[PDB]
């Protein structure tokens, strides 16, 4: 299990997980707040 967790900590697997989570977050943000050209909250 330690070796498998070490494999999960290697550069491509960790990069894939991180970038997939980031892409999912950005896609969900773009669904819930679509067509954002300005920052109108202030």
Partner 1 sequence: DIAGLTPCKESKQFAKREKQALKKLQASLKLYADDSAPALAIKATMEKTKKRFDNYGKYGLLCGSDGLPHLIVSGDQRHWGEFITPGILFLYIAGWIGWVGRSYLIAIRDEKKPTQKEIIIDVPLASSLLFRGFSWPVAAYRELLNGELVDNN
Partner 2 sequence: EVKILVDRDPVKTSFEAWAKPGHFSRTIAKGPETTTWIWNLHADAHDFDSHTSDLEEISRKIFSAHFGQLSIIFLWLSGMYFHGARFSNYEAWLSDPTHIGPSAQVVWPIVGQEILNGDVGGGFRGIQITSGFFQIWRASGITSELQLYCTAIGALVFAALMLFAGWFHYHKAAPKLAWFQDVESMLNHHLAGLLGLGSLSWAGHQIHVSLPINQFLNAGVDPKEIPLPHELILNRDLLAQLYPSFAEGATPFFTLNWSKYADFLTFRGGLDPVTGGLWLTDTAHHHLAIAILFLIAGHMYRTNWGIGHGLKDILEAHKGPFTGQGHKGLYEILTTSWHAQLALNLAMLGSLTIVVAHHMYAMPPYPYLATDYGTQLSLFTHHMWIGGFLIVGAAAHAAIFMVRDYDPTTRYNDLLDRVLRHRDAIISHLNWACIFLGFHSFGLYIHNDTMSALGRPQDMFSDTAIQLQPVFAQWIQNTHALAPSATAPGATASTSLTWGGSDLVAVGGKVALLPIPLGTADFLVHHIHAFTIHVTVLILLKGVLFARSSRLIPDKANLGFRFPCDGPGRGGTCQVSAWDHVFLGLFWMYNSISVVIFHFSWKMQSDVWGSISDQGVVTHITGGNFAQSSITINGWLRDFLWAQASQVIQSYGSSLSAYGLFFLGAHFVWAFSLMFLFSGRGYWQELIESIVWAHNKLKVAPATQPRALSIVQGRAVGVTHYLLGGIATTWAFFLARIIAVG
Annotated binding-site residue? 15: no
Q: After which residues does the chain show a gap where C to N exceeds 2.5 Å?
A: none
Q: Provide the minimum distance between the beta carbon of 34 and partner 1 in the complex, in angstroms, as a whole number.
A: 6
Tokens of 22: 């980031």
Q: Is 35 in the site for ligand CLA (CB under 6 A)?
A: yes
Q: Is 1 in the site for partner 1 (CB under 8 A)?
A: no
Residues numbered 1 to 42 that lie near partner 2 (CB under 8 A) are: 2-4, 6-7, 10, 27, 30-31, 34
The one-character DSSP state at 35 is S
């Amino acid at each position: 299990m330690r070796d498998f967790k070490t494999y999960l900590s290697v550069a491509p697997v960790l990069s894939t997980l991180w970038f997939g989570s980031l892409a999912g977050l950005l896609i969900e943000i773009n669904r819930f707040f679509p067509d954002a050209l300005t920052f109108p909250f202030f």
